Amino acid sequence: DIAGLTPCSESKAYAKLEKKELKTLEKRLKQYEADSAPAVALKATMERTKARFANYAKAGLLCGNDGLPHLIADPGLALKYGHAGEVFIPTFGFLYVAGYIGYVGRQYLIAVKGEAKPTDKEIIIDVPLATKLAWQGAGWPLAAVQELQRGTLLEKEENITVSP
Amino acid sequence: MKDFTTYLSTAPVIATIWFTFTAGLLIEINRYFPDPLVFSF
Amino acid sequence: VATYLSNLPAYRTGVAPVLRGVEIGLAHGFLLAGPFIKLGPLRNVPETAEIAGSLSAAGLVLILALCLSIYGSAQFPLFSADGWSEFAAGFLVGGEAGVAWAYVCT
Amino acid sequence: KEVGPKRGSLVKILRPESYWFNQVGKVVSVDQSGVRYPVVVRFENQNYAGVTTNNYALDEVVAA
Amino acid sequence: KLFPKFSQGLAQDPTTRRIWYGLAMAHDFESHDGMTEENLYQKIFASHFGQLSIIFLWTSGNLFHVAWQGNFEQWVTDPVHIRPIAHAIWDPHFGQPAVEAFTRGGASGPVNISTSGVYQWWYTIGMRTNQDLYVGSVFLALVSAIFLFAGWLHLQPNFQPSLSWFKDAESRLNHHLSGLFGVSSLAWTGHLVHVAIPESRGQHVGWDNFLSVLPHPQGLTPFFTGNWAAYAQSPDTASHVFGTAQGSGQAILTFLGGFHPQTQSLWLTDMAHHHLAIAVIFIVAGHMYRTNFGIGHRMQAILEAHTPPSGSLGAGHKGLFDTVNNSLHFQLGLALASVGTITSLVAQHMYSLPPYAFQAIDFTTQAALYTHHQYIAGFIMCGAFAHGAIFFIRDYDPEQNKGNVLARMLDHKEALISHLSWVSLFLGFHTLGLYVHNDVMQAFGTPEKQILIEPVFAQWIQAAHGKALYGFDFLLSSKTSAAFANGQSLWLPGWLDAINNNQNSLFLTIGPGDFLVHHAIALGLHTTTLILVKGALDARGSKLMPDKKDFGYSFPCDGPGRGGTCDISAYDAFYLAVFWMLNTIGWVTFYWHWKHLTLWQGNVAQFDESSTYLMGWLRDYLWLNSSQLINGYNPFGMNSLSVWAWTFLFGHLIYATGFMFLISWRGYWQELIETLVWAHEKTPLANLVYWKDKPVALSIVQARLVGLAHFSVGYIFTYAAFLIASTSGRF
Amino acid sequence: AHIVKIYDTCIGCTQCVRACPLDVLEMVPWDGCKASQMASAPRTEDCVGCKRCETACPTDFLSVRVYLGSESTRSMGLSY
Amino acid sequence: IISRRESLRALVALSGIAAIVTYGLKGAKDADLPITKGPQTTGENGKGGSV
Amino acid sequence: AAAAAAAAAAAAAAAAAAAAAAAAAA
Amino acid sequence: SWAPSVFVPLTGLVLPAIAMATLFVYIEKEAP
Amino acid sequence: THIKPSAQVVWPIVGQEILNGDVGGGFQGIQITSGFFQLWRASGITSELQLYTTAIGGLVMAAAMFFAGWFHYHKAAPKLEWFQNVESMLNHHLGGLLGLGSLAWAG
Ligand code: CLA
Ligand code: CLA
Ligand code: CLA
Ligand code: CLA
Ligand SMILES: CC1=C(/C=C/C(C)=C/C=C/C(C)=C/C=C/C=C(C)/C=C/C=C(C)/C=C/C2=C(C)CCCC2(C)C)C(C)(C)CCC1
Ligand code: SF4
């Protein structure tokens, strides 16, 4: 109960919709023998389903008027009420991987311009070079903020313009 | 076969190997971790 | 056909433009009344089927007669400011006669 | 004397309407005559017409 | 040879684009032959009389057809169940089932139900009888003839204004703020207090007895003494009946907030104190600028002197005044920016705060009046950037604008466009990606795996305005706060009763379907500005074409060279945005209509379940609500929706005709016409006929405009057919 | 009558003249280049503005330059 | 009657006068124009469903 | 036709002033 | 009362046809 | 008459196993519409052994076709006047491909 909401372990339309889905799976399950793999598959679907509802209520996800897990994307309402795993943890779990791919792709382009013809090595990726920058870019925020302090991250007004 | 490894190191071939890597990694994780809507512990 | 094109009044140069528009007027006179008199909005009224369709078709001749005179003031022995005005005059008088000639032919 | 830079030096283009404005290329030759635009510069960056060279004047052209 | 009297370069054109460009640059006064700047301002000034004389003839037309063919005197007595009438129908193409299916509203012949809602506006400003509407029509028809004659006389050489009369930005802005805005609103409170307040209390104040009826029982005595609260003593009660004296009340300037209980409209009394208050402020703000009397502010010393130190904004606003006063496209671009935002502000504040009686009960009126002033706002806002892009070509002077804030815009112009291109790309990735994620979770039968982010940052605002549905207990939902306790007699209890009513459109309750669509609106706002600000900034040149200013605003291309330059001009950069504009206003009006359909039907959960994923937009709003629209005519019969059924297919037809001018381009068509010229010049007996203007295909820039017009007309007529007939079909 | 105006950035490689499908362009002596020649447009009455000239100029920010003016019966490319 | 341009311009315009000023009253056929009829049975109901 | 002929007899004097406006301006 | 059966064929058949004509003959005037 | 034809089965990972419908016949899978089962009853297949042996016969034939394009380009590629015998190509394609093909299929 943060913004008119309720815990999904406490709401009833959530549990009503769980019983709605398991009803649809079981009336689909009835057409098969109890040994048959079209019934082994559906009972494995249920145990993935029933554990999914158990795990969403375990994490304390917020339901509402429709009985669905609602997310809270604000720190200070997720840090305070124990919901940083909804948005506030994957907003840095993403931005680690995002700037990682950016930094590896940056370092591959920076370390290819001092060559004979760098356009050839954007077709033919230097795999012993590219994987070497791939592994060693794992501390990229530790390397970027040191490059941020110099002035070597931002190229100056050598950049190309039209008519300022 | 050095010329054959250049072909394996072109742009679309590394793209179709790395995308089978990255999808195939996320497929195996989403098998052994069924339905991660929220970061649990 | 080089024989037949020298017959019909668009190419008869040796005729006055009044009689030229008169024959063109009646020829399109009792002919364009056909669709209105048969399959207009009054097919299924067996007294107005020849009246209003012919009266509408005479209205269409009136539009085309204005549509001719508009062309003569736009464009400029027929291709003249006067020969065309005699041509559109004969089409109006020849066209209204032919639409009445269509209603006579009942 | 020999006006313009040397035969193969790096250079920076200052013509604001050129495609290689603020951009670095190599001088290939400087014509020693009364031509308005003697300095011939070759680039790696090809333009929108695929032409990698152009003539420039003495004053639109700065070293390094 | 004679028709483009303004452009002799078009008069020497032997082809048929002479007709098309005689029409389309006839109001491009800056490019006519022999045009001077004194001749420029006089034709603009007379044309504004031409726009005003049309508007008042238009409005007098609305007053006439309502007074003659409408049922306003019948609608006054029962304003809920009786449907309004726009104008009666005489279409002789009709059939007898199409006469009796359009007779409705208790009328005699066929009629149109007015969805413009000018009855609710007229009923609350005091109109009660048809004889009061004919007088208003004859009045505006006189006033429209005044502005016709004024635009004629202010072109006559005795009465032509001087060139310095137009550039007096001091005296205009001093007169239009104080007189045109202040005195007008002061006079409109004069219409409210004298006439429109006591007409709701069941007291006829006509032109015969307005010099006999006191508006207030102790009138003009509190104004001259000072106790102005005497004007708010006995207001319209909570059991008032609009149009009668049953629980009437006697106050003239009350300050309540919230809504009238019957009409669910704004109170008439605080609308009187509203237009009185801003009348005082506009008159006071209308004594600011130095015209002729030694006091006031000079515009030439407020812009230039606001330069921040340490080079924050270049040379400040130094030198803008001669580039605003001399340039018209800068003045037009500001005006279309201002009016285009306070056209949305009209639309955003009339569904939530309906100002006219028995509005927000007539639902088709509410649907039309919101959607109208959103597309009207959409077209005006993209023209602000259009005439902002014409400014940088026709009027911009870099020597005059050394280092000001306007040139720093062109200086860091790639930082503007690339940061817009990041925001537009981030929103489009992560709004579509969430809907597709939700759609797949609906497709795999598991709605619990959806991404449903609760709109915290807006629910925090609604709770701060007094919506205790969410329980933030922050400011006005907080009963022990300060702002709650500074206004319990001032303006709050009407306002707080009006939000927490669940059945009006005042601060609707929102869920994660409203999270996703406001970001989609934010996508559509940031992308439409991306196209337009790029069209403004790169109007003078790019690296692809560094002399775009030499061709002009509206040119086709610069050839196939340099890789190909289709759609390079700033006109062609403006026109792409109209697609992304109609998309964006299409997104705000889909969301407005469907949240209001589910509100007015009652199934308010049918939106919030289905708005979280894009199939529910399709199979619950477009599929479900077009059931009675497309059944307007069938082989069983037809009903009153057949004129909106026909237009709904008529709108799809103009729309798809627009793709013909957009996908097929000119040069397929010019070769096709060359065969038609051959087959005309060789056909016997049709060689009697020959053209004057040579048939050529429509030019490249024209094909943009003709195709965008067919795109946009068919866009508008489609949705307006769906909007009117889905609302009024079930209502 | 289209407006074709060329500039001093011409080098006189005469590729614009060979590319012009309407003989708008011709080569005039001029000392500001090694090839001692600069183009000229004495026949802009015949120009359609198809811009095959400035697809062919090698110089950056094209030396030949075509401005689409008012279209007569020769500028619209008409056999009729 | 008419042989020049401006005589034909008058006769077409006056024939357009003579049809239309009659078409409003005498020329509205009983079977052609159902608007020029009497008020038939019903139709004046609400817009349906709800309000 | 009371207010029709009175507006027409008003339009007569209005047109007569229009003959004053159609000459005194040029 | 007889108005909507008269003004509509004027504005829709007759007065546009005058504007179809006069605003066409004006187009192809040869300028003196 | 009752069992719907189905020949595509998906993997149960993200909930996409719901695309394995109840097509009948003790089976779950995507109900296909390409009509191979009607070819195969017309071919009289009657067993999934026959479908497997002609699938291995398809892989063998595909590698033979990849060999043939490799052979007739890289190792032994025809001259120009081989291709310009359009009389010999039509006599062979009308007789051998279309003629003997429909003789063989009738058999
Ligand atoms: C006090 C004297 C005075 C007054 C009353 C006016 C009045 C006017 N001038 Mg003006 N003028 C004046 C002095 C004055 N002028 C002087 C001294 C100069 C010379 C320096 C000029 C120079 C000048 C020029 C050059 C032009 C005008 C124009 C206009 C017209 C404005 C267009 C319009 O109607 O939009 C008025 C707009 C509104 C009323 C809407 C805005 C109001 C609010 C903020 C919007 C939201 C509320 C809305 C009203 C609610 C609507 C509800 C309901 C009505 C639907 C208007 C008649 C223009 C015109 O049309 O020419 C005649 C024009 O081109 N004037
Ligand atoms: C205050 C309003 C205002 C004013 C005065 C102007 C004034 C001007 N604009 Mg501008 N403009 C405006 C608003 C305004 N604009 C808005 C809101 C937009 C965005 C939609 C634009 C977009 C715009 C562009 C892109 C251009 C101009 C141009 C011009 C100039 C030439 C006028 C012209 O081409 O008219 C002639 C107009 C027409 C012939 C109308 C064309 C057809 C339109 C689309 C109407 C079609 C409606 C359709 C027929 C509906 C019927 C459907 C049927 C089924 C019922 C002139 C200075 C041009 C310019 O300056 O060139 C450099 C130019 O290129 N304007
Ligand atoms: C439904 C049609 C549609 C769509 C999707 C777009 C999308 C876009 N337009 Mg628009 N546009 C359209 C119609 C459309 N437009 C029309 C009709 C016009 C008029 C001509 C324009 C005119 C226009 C202009 C003028 C501009 C745009 C811009 C943009 C971009 C906005 C940034 C954004 O949201 O990025 C988000 C984009 C997406 C979510 C689409 C990507 C889809 C997925 C994520 C890609 C990966 C999926 C998959 C792996 C790929 C499969 C391929 C293969 C492997 C099989 C985006 C690419 C602007 C731009 O470039 O901004 C950056 C811009 O300036 N457009
Ligand atoms: C009677 C002999 C015969 C037969 C059966 C064929 C059959 C074929 N020829 Mg062909 N051809 C022949 C003689 C023959 N040709 C001669 C004499 C010439 C020279 C004039 C050519 C020149 C020729 C060209 C230039 C092309 C063909 C192509 C084709 C194929 C058509 C593709 C198709 O419809 O799929 C039908 C597919 C099948 C029936 C599958 C069975 C395939 C069999 C096993 C291979 C064909 C039999 C082979 C010719 C016999 C030699 C065996 C080999 C081991 C030596 C088809 C395989 C086209 C093709 O696809 O290129 C590869 C093509 O481009 N032929
Ligand atoms: C291109 C260009 C142009 C154009 C531009 C434009 C078009 C613009 C627009 C603009 C816009 C469109 C803007 C907007 C703005 C807005 C704003 C800025 C807002 C603000 C807000 C506020 C401030 C609020 C406040 C508040 C709140 C918070 C709520 C409550 C109340 C209050 C008041 C408190 C021109 C022409 C100049 C020319 C040059 C260039
Ligand atoms: S414009 Fe067209 S025609 Fe004139 S030169 Fe350039 S290319 Fe040749």
Gyration radius (Cα) of chain E, Å:
29
What residue ranges define each of the domains in chain A, with the CATH number in brackets?
Answer: 1-164 (1.10.8.110)
Tokens of E166: 């137009």
CA distances for A58 relative to A10, A54, A69, E441, angstroms = 11, 6, 12, 21
Rounded Cα distance, E491 and E488, in Å: 7
> Are residues E594 and E607 in contact, defined by beta-carbon separation less than 8 angstroms?
yes
Which residues in chain G touch residue I17, judged by CB atoms under 8 angstroms apart?
16
Longest dimension (CA), chain H: 37
Q: Which phi and psi angles does E374 have, rounded to 5°?
A: -95, -40
Q: Which residues pair with I2 in a beta bridge?
A: none
Contacts of E476 (CB under 8 A, 6+ apart): E463, E464, E465, E466, E483, E484, E492, E496
Q: Which phi and psi angles does E688 have, rounded to 5°?
A: -60, -35
Rounded Cα distance, E128 and E123, in Å: 6
Report the separation in Å between the CA atom of J19 and the middle of ligand 3, taken as the mean of its atom positions. 30
Residue bearing tokens 């006999």: E212
Q: Is residue E416 lining ligand 5, measured as CB closer than 6 Å? A: no
| Fold topology of F1-80 | Alpha-Beta Plaits (3.30.70)
Q: Which residues pair with D27 in a beta bridge?
A: D41
End-to-end C-alpha distance for chain H, whole angstroms = 37
Collapse the DSSP code of E168 into the 3-class scheme (helix H, G, I; strand E, B; otherwise coil) and give the result: coil
The DSSP element (H or E) to which G19 belongs, if any, is helix G5-23
Report the separation in Å between the CA atom of G11 and the middle of ligand 6, taken as the mean of its atom positions. 53
- Nearest-atom index, ligand 5, CA of E406: 39
Collapse the DSSP code of E572 into the 3-class scheme (helix H, G, I; strand E, B; otherwise coil) and give the result: helix
Amino acid, single-letter form, for residue E80: V
Pocket test for ligand 1, best of E140, E172, E289, E348 (most atoms within 8 A of CB): E172
B33 in contact with A, Cβ within 8 Å = no
Burial string for E475-492 (b: 16+ CB within 10 Å, else e) reads bbbbeeeeebeeeeeeeb
> Are residues E200 and E124 in contact, defined by beta-carbon separation less than 8 angstroms?
yes
Instruction: Supply the DSSP string of G24-46, one letter for each residue.
Output: TTSS--TTT-SSSS---S-----
Amino acid, single-letter form, for residue E187: A
SS3 string of chain D? Answer: CCCCCCCCCEEEECCCCCCCCCCEEEEEEECCCCCCCCEEEECCCCCCCCCCEEEECCCCEEEC
Rounded Cα distance, E580 and E53, in Å: 33
The DSSP element (H or E) to which A6 belongs, if any, is strand A6-7
Report the separation in Å between the CA atom of E93 and the middle of ligand 6, taken as the mean of its atom positions. 55
For atom 64 of ligand 4, which residue has the closest CA?
A: J83
Contact call for B38 and A56, based on CB within 8 A:
yes
Report the separation in Å between the CA atom of E533 and the middle of ligand 5, taken as the mean of its atom positions. 15
Report the separation in Å between the CA atom of E519 and the middle of ligand 5, taken as the mean of its atom positions. 19
CA distances for G37 relative to C55, E274, E444, E526, angstroms = 21, 51, 60, 57
Rounded Cα distance, E360 and E79, in Å: 12
> Are residues E26 and E6 in contact, defined by beta-carbon separation less than 8 angstroms?
yes
Rounded Cα distance, J28 and E367, in Å: 48
Which residues in chain B touch residue A61, judged by CB atoms under 8 angstroms apart?
37-38
Tally G–I CB contacts below 8 A: 21
Instruction: Supply the DSSP string of E386-435, one letter for each residue.
Output: HHHHHIIIII--TTTTTTSHHHHHHHTHHHHHHHHHHHHHHHHHHHHHHH
| CA neighbor of E555 nearest in space, from E382, E704, E364, E448 | E704
Tokens of J98: 């279309």
Rounded Cα distance, F22 and D55, in Å: 28
Task: Classify residue E537 by burial, with Cβ atoms within 10 Å: 0-12, 13-18, 19+.
Answer: buried
> Are residues E553 and E541 in contact, defined by beta-carbon separation less than 8 angstroms?
no
Find the angle CA(F57)-CA(F63)-CA(F69) to the nearest 5 degrees. Answer: 105
Q: Which residues pair with D61 in a beta bridge?
A: D13
Instruction: Supply the DSSP string of I1-32, one letter for each residue.
Output: --GGGTHHHIIIIIHHHHHHHHHHHTTTPPP-
What residue ranges define each of the domains in chain E, with the CATH number in brackets?
Answer: 1-731 (1.20.1130.10)
Rounded Cα distance, G34 and E95, in Å: 6
Q: Where are the domains of chain D?
A: 1-64
Collapse the DSSP code of E485 into the 3-class scheme (helix H, G, I; strand E, B; otherwise coil) and give the result: helix
Q: Dihedral of the CA atoms I16, I18, I21, I26 (nearest 10)?
A: -110
Q: Is residue F48 lining ligand 6, measured as CB closer than 6 Å? A: yes
Tokens of D1: 């004397």
Rounded Cα distance, J64 and F11, in Å: 60
- Considering CB atoms only, which of I5, I6, I14 is closest to G16? I14
Rounded Cα distance, E299 and F18, in Å: 58
> Are residues A77 and A57 in contact, defined by beta-carbon separation less than 8 angstroms?
no
| CA neighbor of E74 nearest in space, from E104, E110, E116 | E104
DSSP3 helix / strand / coil % (chain E, rounded to 5): 60, 0, 40
Collapse the DSSP code of E102 into the 3-class scheme (helix H, G, I; strand E, B; otherwise coil) and give the result: coil
Contact call for E99 and G34, based on CB within 8 A:
yes
J14 in contact with B, Cβ within 8 Å = yes
| CA neighbor of E552 nearest in space, from E31, E24, E12 | E31
End-to-end C-alpha distance for chain G, whole angstroms = 63
CA distances for A13 relative to A17, A19, A20, A68, angstroms = 6, 10, 10, 8
Contact call for E694 and F80, based on CB within 8 A:
yes
> Are residues E493 and A111 in contact, defined by beta-carbon separation less than 8 angstroms?
no
| CA neighbor of E237 nearest in space, from E499, E494, E505, E495 | E494
Task: Classify residue E91 by burial, with Cβ atoms within 10 Å: 0-12, 13-18, 19+.
Answer: middle
Amino acid, single-letter form, for residue A137: G
> Are residues E350 and E370 in contact, defined by beta-carbon separation less than 8 angstroms?
yes
A33 in contact with D, Cβ within 8 Å = no
Contact call for G3 and C85, based on CB within 8 A:
yes
CATH superfamily of B1-41: Single helix bin (1.20.5.510)
Q: Is residue E574 lining ligand 2, measured as CB closer than 6 Å? A: yes
End-to-end C-alpha distance for chain A, whole angstroms = 54
The DSSP element (H or E) to which E729 belongs, if any, is helix E700-730
> Are residues E342 and E374 in contact, defined by beta-carbon separation less than 8 angstroms?
no
Side-chain-facing half-sphere of E218: CA atoms under 13 Å = 15
| Fold topology of D1-64 | SH3 type barrels. (2.30.30)
Q: Is residue E570 lining ligand 5, measured as CB closer than 6 Å? A: no
Residues in chain B: 41
The chains in contact with chain C, meaning 3 or more Cβ pairs closer than 8 Å, are E, G, I
Q: Where are the domains of chain B?
A: 1-41
Q: Cβ < 6 Å from ligand 4: which residues?
A: J 82-83, 85, 88-89, 92-93, 96-97
CA distances for A113 relative to E281, E334, G25, angstroms = 64, 47, 89
The DSSP element (H or E) to which F38 belongs, if any, is strand F37-40
Helical axes G5-23 vs C83-104, angle rounded to 10°: 40
Instruction: Supply the DSSP string of F2-29, one letter for each residue.
Output: -EE---TT-----HHHHH-TT---EEEE
- Considering CB atoms only, which of A24, A65, A74 is closest to E456? A74
Burial string for E410-434 (b: 16+ CB within 10 Å, else e) reads beebbebbeebeebbeebbeebeeb
Interface mutation target, options G32, G41, G47, chain E, most CBs of E under 10 Å: G47
Q: Which phi and psi angles does C41 have, rounded to 5°?
A: -75, -5
DSSP3 helix / strand / coil % (chain C, rounded to 5): 65, 0, 35
Tokens of E127: 């109109």
> Are residues E301 and E289 in contact, defined by beta-carbon separation less than 8 angstroms?
no
Contact call for E685 and C8, based on CB within 8 A:
yes
Breakpoints of chain D, after residues (C–N > 2.5 Å): none
Side-chain-facing half-sphere of G22: CA atoms under 13 Å = 9
**E540: nearest CA in chain A?**
A163
| CA neighbor of E621 nearest in space, from E634, E603, E638 | E603
Q: Which residues pair with D54 in a beta bridge?
A: D41
F43 in contact with E, Cβ within 8 Å = no
Breakpoints of chain I, after residues (C–N > 2.5 Å): none
The chains in contact with chain H, meaning 3 or more Cβ pairs closer than 8 Å, are E
Alpha-helical regions (H) of chain A: 13-29, 37-58, 90-110, 120-123, 127-136, 140-150
Rounded Cα distance, C62 and G12, in Å: 7
Contact call for I25 and C66, based on CB within 8 A:
no
Rounded Cα distance, J101 and J107, in Å: 10
Task: Classify residue H8 by burial, with Cβ atoms within 10 Å: 0-12, 13-18, 19+.
Answer: exposed
**E450: nearest CA in chain B?**
B37
> Are residues B34 and A152 in contact, defined by beta-carbon separation less than 8 angstroms?
no
Q: Is residue E554 lining ligand 2, measured as CB closer than 6 Å? A: yes
How would you list the strands of the sheet with D61-63, edge to edge? D53-56, D39-42, D24-30, D10-13, D61-63
The reported resolution of this PDB entry, expressed in Å, is 3.3
Q: Which phi and psi angles does E696 have, rounded to 5°?
A: -125, 160
Contact call for C70 and I21, based on CB within 8 A:
yes
Beta carbons within 10 angstroms of residue B41's beta carbon: 5
Contact call for A45 and J17, based on CB within 8 A:
yes
Tokens of E629: 């629209």
Residue bearing tokens 């019903």: G42
**E441: nearest CA in chain B?**
B35
**A48: nearest CA in chain J?**
J15
Interface mutation target, options E31, E569, E675, E696, chain F, most CBs of F under 10 Å: E696
The DSSP element (H or E) to which E535 belongs, if any, is helix E512-537
The DSSP element (H or E) to which E452 belongs, if any, is strand E452-453
For atom 22 of ligand 4, which residue has the closest CA?
A: J89
Which residues in chain G touch residue E82, judged by CB atoms under 8 angstroms apart?
none
Side-chain-facing half-sphere of B2: CA atoms under 13 Å = 0
A116 in contact with D, Cβ within 8 Å = no
- Considering CB atoms only, which of F8, F34, F60 is closest to D19? F60
Q: Is residue E73 lining ligand 2, measured as CB closer than 6 Å? A: no
- Considering CB atoms only, which of C8, C10, C75 is closest to E692? C75
> Are residues F30 and F13 in contact, defined by beta-carbon separation less than 8 angstroms?
no
Beta carbons within 10 angstroms of residue E166's beta carbon: 18
Rounded Cα distance, G13 and E339, in Å: 46
